């Protein structure tokens with residue numbers, strides 16, 4: 001091949017590393033060819049270095065992955081880039097295509113294809129393309145005053161190429177992925193000693209480049225730091241490897257303290273972005289942990305990640321799905337089981353992560369049921385952790401950012417296997433034009449389970465928790481949001497007898513207009529009575545509910561088409577119901593809503609509800625509800 005003995009590799013290595021004794025001896029004598037041979041011997045016999053990305057005892061290849069691998073064999077890269085590979089090949093002006101090419105997305109497919117098929121064509125070809133990329137993509141620099149005077153050509157093109165081949169985004173991707181390529185191809189005779197020295201010199205150059213080019217902020221900085229830990233954990237024989245690990249750890253530790261509330265919730269208030277953050281922080285912890293470097297992480301980092309996991313476990317439903325608040329789609333059970341299995345290896349003394357990883361075969365659930373997160377603004381009522389549970393998750397928190405929607409007070413509710421109050425969801429993640437109109441539709445306050453004034457989006461999103469009482473046969477949340485100028489919305493949620501919910505909405509202030517109490521119904525056949533202000537699902541036996549709203553004289557009800565989305569660019573029709581009251585003076589507007597889950601619709605009880613205090617009380621509430629004629633008082637003092 002075109003690989004050559006890069007004897008400068010030996011100066012990059014800690015030649016006192018255990019197992020490198022013959023490398024060190026040969027290098028000291030100037031026998032660098034024999035030293036390179038001994039170095040390959042060392043890596044082939046190594047031993048205490050693995051990655052979570054691959055199990056060399058369980059290598060598989062997918063159908064598209066075999067397809068990318070076979071294309072790679074013919075220089076088609078996941079276009080045909082020629083026999084003499086044109087790494088700058090531009091058929092049309094496409095910067096995105098040029099950057100994507102330098103991710104080498106087909107190298108690892110060829111590795112897997114090499115191991116599963118067992119024939120050297122994949123390893124031969126990859127060695128060639130690996131070296132050829134090194135040769136045709138040098139990392140160079142030029143003065144800007146000279147760059148402007150140079151004309152187009154090989155020297156100018158090489159300098160401009162650096163913007164594409166060595167952008168930190170792609171460089172850090174290769175830092176991680178090449179640990180997979182290394183493990184897959186190392187047994188091959190094409191993986192010669194000279195090639196090894198080329199691989200390590202190139203790899204080291206990538207790590208040094210990232211250290212010099214860390215992003216200022218964002219998820220990109222997290223991935224750079226995580227992959228610097230990859231570099232230093234997978235090649236701890238580099239002199240600089242402990243420094244690379246420490247660099248990445250310090251960054252991740254600092255950023256998790258900026259991003260995560262003390263109760264464990266990530267500050268975007270978005271379950272999907274919360275889970276993505278867990279996984280960045282755990283992938284870093286995992287590569288270190290499996291290679292003996294767990295102790296390099298500060299204890300506060302371990303504790304914070306464990307709190308993020310417990311936060312996610314709490315706001316999830318017993319079927320492992322998450323509420324679709326903010327921009328969150330549903331992450332399904334198969335993916336979450338894989339997540340809990342990985343997390344349980346990282347926190348093996350956490351008995352709840354173990355329970356969730358094993359679906360209850362081992363481990364233990366927490367010694368609590370309902371649970372509140374007072375900094376993040378998420379509140380969970382539950383009568384069980386299992387598939388028979390009744391569970392509500394209420395979102396009523398501080399201001400968020402891009403993903404968070406104006407939905408303070410909204411909730412999802414899940415009963416005995418089915419989500420009966422799903423969020424309208426995200427639907428459109430990003431776009432322009434008509435799709436942007438649909439993204440904003442789903443962000444409206446009026447397409448959530450909360451209160452609006454004239455159906456307007458909340459002007460302020462900054463909930464205050466007045467009371468949180470998670471224990472007993474009456475559990476209570478009281479939250480208040482100054483939703484509009486001269487308008488305060490106090491929502492009281494009672495979870496009664498571990499069975500049903502009573503939601504009291506009280507709007508105070510001098511603001512006038514139409515007060516709208518919105519509920520977004522589940523999909524399917526739902527019976528309603530305008531006379532009684534009742535809604536009763538007509539679903540298959542197992543998970544049903546009855547909702548009834550009790551309001552002042554003259555309350556009206558309106559049903560409009562609405563939408564629910566659990567996956568991006570997919571949505572289904574369901575009813576958007578509002579209970580509307582004309583607020584034409586300074587008196588408060590007050591509602592009581594009963595929500596009662598039942599397995600069979602025919603068993604849904606009759607309700608009544610009344611305020612005992614006929615005037616709004618800034619410092620308390622007392623109501624009386626009836627269930628099949630049986631009285632229950634619900635009250636609190638603030």
Ligand SMILES: [Mg+2]
Pocket residue numbers: 324325326405407423424425426442443448
């Ligand atoms: Mg929403």
